[PDB]
Amino acid sequence: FDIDMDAPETERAAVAIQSQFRKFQKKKAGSQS
Template identity: 75%
Template sequence: MSENSSSDPPNSTQGPITDDKAAQEKLESKGANPPTQEPEEEIDIDLEAPETEKAALAIQNQFRRFQKKKK
């Protein structure tokens, strides 16, 4: 018979690993290798340009068609 029967409640040394311990281990492992983030490149778009307006209208029309087709 096993040491931990179904009628005996598990004590702190016999129980499974809790979520807190697992979360702590994940944080420790992530702390060793911090992700390297590249600085975002700022893109300057002229919102008043005629090409930009045409592109925006084309994107909106395609989206509206997609929404109609989806229904």
């Protein structure tokens, strides 16, 4: 890893990717109707 785990920015960055990832999967399974 070798990253600033303590730095809130790192933790926040992880959330953004994960949040987007979860939404990404939903879009794939999403249907026009």
